[PDB]
Structures are given as C-alpha cells and as structure tokens.
Homo-oligomer: A and B are copies of this chain.
Amino acid sequence: EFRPLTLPPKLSLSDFNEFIQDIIRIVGSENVEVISMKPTHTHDPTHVMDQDYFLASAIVAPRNVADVQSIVGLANKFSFPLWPISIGRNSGYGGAAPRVSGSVVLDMGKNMNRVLEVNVEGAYCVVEPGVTYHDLHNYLEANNLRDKLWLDVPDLGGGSVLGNAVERGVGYTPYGDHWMMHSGMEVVLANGELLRTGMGALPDPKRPETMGLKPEDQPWSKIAHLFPYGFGPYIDGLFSQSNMGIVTKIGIWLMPNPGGYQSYLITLPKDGDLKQAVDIIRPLRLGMALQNVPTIRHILLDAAVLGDKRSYSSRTEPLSDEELDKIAKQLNLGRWNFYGALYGPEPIRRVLWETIKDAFSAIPGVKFYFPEDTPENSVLRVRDKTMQGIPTYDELKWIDWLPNGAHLFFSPIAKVSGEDAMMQYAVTKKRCQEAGLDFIGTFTVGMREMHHIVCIVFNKKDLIQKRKVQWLMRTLIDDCAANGWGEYRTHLAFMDQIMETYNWNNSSFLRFNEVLKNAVDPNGIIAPGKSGVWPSQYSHVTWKL
C-alpha cells in the first residue's frame, strides 16, 4: 500500500512504496500491513507518551528465514529501519511498538512458529520466535512429554519462549533464569548473513539425507544445544536486549520432571515484615533450600488478580495503610506474600520444608498454606501451576486495576537484604503516593539478587495522570540510581534515561556498545534505539528521550 501515517526517517513516499511493493512480492499481500489475545503491533498500547511516538509504518510477517534476509537486504538498500518482534504481548514494555516511528515492525511470530525439536535425552527444546509458552506446553502434551519434561513460565503464558529469553525474562521453577538456559541460537545479522552460536557453529557432518538444504534448514550438531560456549569469544549475549541481530531460532534447556512437587504460600502479616522475610530468604536461597525463583508479592497484586479497585473501595485516591490491612484480612492473606515450591522425592522435600517453616516462624503471625488449604479462586492455586511449568491466563486480571488501565513496569534490582529491600520499597512507595498511585509490586528472588517489578497502572485516556506517570517513572529512575540500583528492563521511552544510568567512567559501556553496533550495522537498520543504542545516522539530539 500507498500513504503511511509516518514515514521512516529521510525516506520519500516513493521509496516507501517501492519497498513495500518489493516485500509484497516476496511474502504476499496477506503478510505486509501498511498503517494509513490479539495484541496490536502498530503502536504502543500502554499509551504513556503522545502520538507520533513509537508508531510503525508497516508490519511485515516473514514466511521464513529467507524472507527475513530478503527483507534485511531491502532495508539496507532503502535504509528502512526494522523492528523485529516475536510476539509483542508485553504491554508494559511497550509491546510491539518500534522505538523510532516509521519503522517496519517485523512480526516473526505469525509465520515462524515451529517447535523445532524436543530432545528428551538432552532435555532441551529448539524453538522459533512464534512459539508461545502455551504452544510449547500443548506441544509437550500431544506427544506425552508432560511427565518427562517440564517448562518454566513467566507469570503469563502467551509470551514468546525465545522473545522472553533473549529479553532475559524470569520464571518460577529451578530453571527460571531463562536467558541462562539457552544454548544454540540462530541469528540473522544486519548484513543479512545467518549465524548460529556456540556449538551451533560446529556443523553437522554431511550425510545423504541432509544434503542441499538451505543453511536455515540444516540440522545442528549434536552438542549445539547441550553446551552453549562453543570456542573463542562467546558472542551470544550481544544478542540479548540488543539491536545487534534478528534471533530466528533458539535452544532452551528443559527441566526433567523431578518426581516430587509441592507449592506453598507463607503469609507475612505486617507491611514491615518484608525486612525480616528477605533477611530469612537470603541464606535459604544461597543455600539451595529454596529451589526455584520464589516470589514475595504485595497484597494489592493478589488483590488485583481477584478484583478491580472499585470492588475493594470507592476512593479514587490511593488506598491507605488501614485499608490494605483490611484487604489482607478479607483475603486471608498477609500484607506481603511469599510463594515458592519444593522439587523432588518426598524425603528431600520434607527436610527442606521443615527448614523453611522453621525459619519463617520467627515472624509473628506467619501462616503456611498449600493449595488445598486455600479458596478455589486463590492465587496460590493459580501459582501452583506456574511453579510447575504449566502456563495460564489468570494473572492478567490485575492489569484492569483502574478502568482504562494500561501499565508500565518500573523494574529495579535490589540486594537480597531486608534493609535494602525495605529502602527501595520506601523510595518507590513515596513517589507512587506523590503521583496519586497505589503502589503495586513483587520481588522475585534471584540467587543473590531480587528483581523488583513495580506495576504502575493508570488511566490510558487521562492526559493528567499519564503525565503524572511519566513524572513518576523518570523520578523513580533517578531516585533509584541515587541509591545505586538500576533497572533491568524498560519501556521504549525510558531506554535512554535508563541507559544514561549506566554511565560509569563517562558512559564507557554505551560508547563501546555504539562501536559494536556501527561495525555490524553500517546502515543502522536493525532497531535503532533499542536499549539506548543508536547507530551514527541517528543524531542523539534529535532522537533520545
């Protein structure tokens, strides 16, 4: 098609139509949309910034890897920026919106869907960008692999197994650190050239049945998904949260059924119980008593899962300390809520579980519950599935906290120290109040770190509050940096700020990144601006926010 709402930088409308005609001729009219459950891929859905911001010109859905190389060629030819997405369901990080309007959103999920391989002896799977978590789960069940191999899912299962992994997302099983569970990745660099990593570089020895296959369709050697390092420089991580390559295929390790599973819930009665709780979790996390990635939730998170905010109050301003206590009682929950699980044979679960309980019993009024012990609608019953690798749609209910809610995640990291966790909670809770927002969040326990997802929800049609939300977010970043904590991930608009945060020694780390980017992407057509990294033809003055 013809006249887009926004053309990518410096490109004429004639150039734009020449290009699109070319891509249409490659992937068919049914896979190239021009902008003149079902996630949008054309714009930031969790509106926070104004219009004209992060608006694609056209969404293109490659049929396969060839198509992605033809499309890269065309972007180099015409200097048309691309914005490669796998699924784009994470509104909160901006979903599928491109950072620089005019871009071509590359929907890799629509046709590049396959569960390429599920290896039981090696306990791994090889996946394309389209393979959501539900998909890999349905794949496992229709092949009876459910009782041999287990997944590891993020709070929502409609996300991409590889998209989430390359973005470094976390899960709640012993295999929760997703990016650390990859081995074998296939990438389409900016020059067009295909590249596979680690032992993906060591090629399967020739054999009659695999002769003549295009590179993209060739099998991988035996150790390709069993050892990640390969030999030499381990370049894999350049492709995480970066614009250095288009990730087309990835191997993810799978957890073999542990032959024993118990999920539990420990409720902490006071809002200041978080300090003792986190001091307790520390030694138990580092000492492997705490098997998976346990979560510490704030009462409104579980409150939200179960009901909107009018369902708990009429107040338009932020619920008070009293009201929060009251909601806790109502739900039989604590003010803070720990969710975890035990894996393996009963004799070992049992020792761990006595230890855990024992530890947490130094917190007055603590109360331990397994799923059965809680109401049918409870979060624990839902999270009992999440910690065993079973994906769900439940926990999405909280996005609706406010009427025309949208949300953004402010995500700092905090030591696994109560002192520190309380400090960061304070900081975020003050600002949230200052903005007139309920604080809503979780700490997910890392072995020596704690990912702190603050869920800022707000009215997507309210000019005043969105501006309040922007103030909040940018103030939180500074505040957090002032206290030496940075965010591990963000939405399109906060990328620059956040990368400006990592400025040790005069921005050394972003300087060095900008070289690697320009070297490998001389026309800078792969996602200019992702994570604050800009190719030289994108003046910082004109583009950073």
Contact = CB atoms under 8 A, between A and B. Distances in A.
Interface of A: 9-10, 12-14, 18, 21-22, 25, 48-50, 69, 73, 77, 121-124, 168, 174, 179-180, 183, 189, 191-197, 199-212, 215, 218, 221-223, 225-227, 229-242, 244, 253, 256, 258-259, 282-283, 286-288, 344-345, 347-348, 351-352, 355, 413-417, 420, 435, 446-449, 466-468, 470-471, 474-475, 481-490, 498-499, 501-513, 515-516, 518-520, 531-533, 539-544
A193 B223 contact: no
B238 A242 contact: no
A131 to B, nearest CB: 20
A12 B15 CA distance: 11
Contacts of A215: 504-505
Contact of A474 (B199, B211, B225): B211
Nearest to A236: B237
Contact of A487 (B122, B231, B347): B231
Contact of A194 (B203, B211, B347, B508): B508
A22 B18 contact: no
A380 to B, nearest CB: 25
B238 A235 contact: yes
B470 A212 contact: yes
Contact of A467 (B211, B259, B489): B211
A449 B233 CA distance: 19
Nearest to A417: B121
A174 to B, nearest CB: 8
Given A22-B12, A241-B234, A413 B227 contact: yes
Given A222-B485, A286-B256, A509-B195, A240 B244 contact: no
A230 B519 contact: no
A458 to B, nearest CB: 13
